Design a binder for this molecule. Structure first.
Ligand SMILES: C[C@@H]1CN(c2cncnc2)Cc2cc(C(=O)Nc3cc(CN4CCN(C)CC4)cc(C(F)(F)F)c3)ccc21
Length: 285
């Protein structure tokens, strides 16, 4: 159990109905101070919130990769319940890219095209790790991607904890609230979530990166039309629709995005392939 006496409060990062998130300093992290994010459960939090908290701890404890959020420690042998992760200073990737303009010499901070590819390749690397562990993320989007120092990307999962992105989730039949615009066609129709559908979502995430998070995927189409589109991928009568090529995206890179959106799960490129393309092949028109 992490010694909670080693956590020095600095600033509250956010609040919730069942807990609080704090930015903490740890002096001499080798066991100047290391900054960490600590989720503390309120002493009056529900037994259901406590259940989610402990299961969240279990899940995270297995994920140890440079492009995945790390669980540093937990304080659970006593109350209040704490979970300690890395602190990603630049917030989520949607908030990060939305604050930048593209570096375009032919034409507020700037971000270059090679840097957008490095960001996407780090997301690919993280996902390759999850896929090799048979772990299906189920909600890959830029909002669930965290930005640290040196343009380091760490894939996370906030769920619906932040009310910031309610427009990105749709309540289907059964009170299940899903991110349909990022979901593969088999997910929306059959609830079939696999590594292959994580690829589809990566494809939509690469679109967001290339758009500098300026627009919602299929923004001109209603939620009902995004669902009806998945039925068109099922019928395979050539009437299904794809996200349009971002202005700064070359045709070669757009062709990779379309592959992630193949009708057949087995035709979608593995994360090892996306990673190599994004890190090596940027020499395309
Ligand atoms: C306090 C702290 C705040 N913070 C933060 C970092 N820098 C700057 N400001 C805040 C990052 C962070 C991330 C997580 C997190 O990422 N946790 C997670 C949970 C699941 C499972 N699962 C549980 C249920 N739920 C519905 C869906 C997700 C799967 C995965 C993943 F992605 F790694 F697989 C990750 C949890 C707590 C915190």
């Amino acid at each position: 159990d992490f010694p909670r006496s080693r956590l020095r409060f600095k600033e509250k990062l956010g609040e919730g109905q069942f807990g609080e998130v704090h930015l903490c300093e740890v002096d001499s992290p080798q066991d100047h101070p290391l900054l960490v994010a600590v989720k503390i459960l309120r002493p009056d939090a529900t037994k259901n919130a406590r259940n989610d908290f402990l299961k969240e701890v279990k899940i995270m404890s297995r994920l140890k990769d440079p492009n995945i959020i790390r669980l540093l420690g937990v304080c659970v042998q006593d109350d209040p319940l704490c979970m300690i992760t890395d602190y990603m200073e630049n917030g989520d990737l949607n908030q990060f890219l939305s604050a930048h303009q593209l570096e375009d010499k032919a034409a507020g901070p700037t971000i270059s095209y090679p840097m957008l590819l490095h960001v996407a390749a780090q997301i690919a690397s993280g996902m390759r790790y999850l896929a090799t562990l048979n772990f299906v993320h189920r909600d890959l989007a830029t909002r669930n991607c965290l930005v640290g120092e040196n343009f380091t990307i760490k894939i996370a999962d906030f769920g619906m904890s932040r009310n910031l992105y309610a427009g990105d989730y749709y309540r289907v039949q059964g009170r299940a609230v899903l991110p349909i615009r990022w979901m593969a066609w088999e997910c929306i129709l059959m609830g079939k979530f696999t590594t292959a559908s994580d690829v589809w979502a990566f494809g939509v995430t690469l679109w967001e990166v290339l758009m500098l998070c300026r627009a919602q995927p299929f923004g001109q189409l209603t939620d009902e039309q995004v669902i009806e589109n998945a039925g068109e991928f099922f019928r395979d009568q050539g009437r299904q629709v794809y996200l349009s090529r971002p202005p700064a995206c070359p045709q070669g890179l757009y062709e990779l995005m379309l592959r992630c959106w193949s009708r057949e799960s087995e035709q979608r490129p593995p994360f090892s392939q996306l990673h190599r393309f994004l890190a090596e092949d940027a020499l395309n028109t």
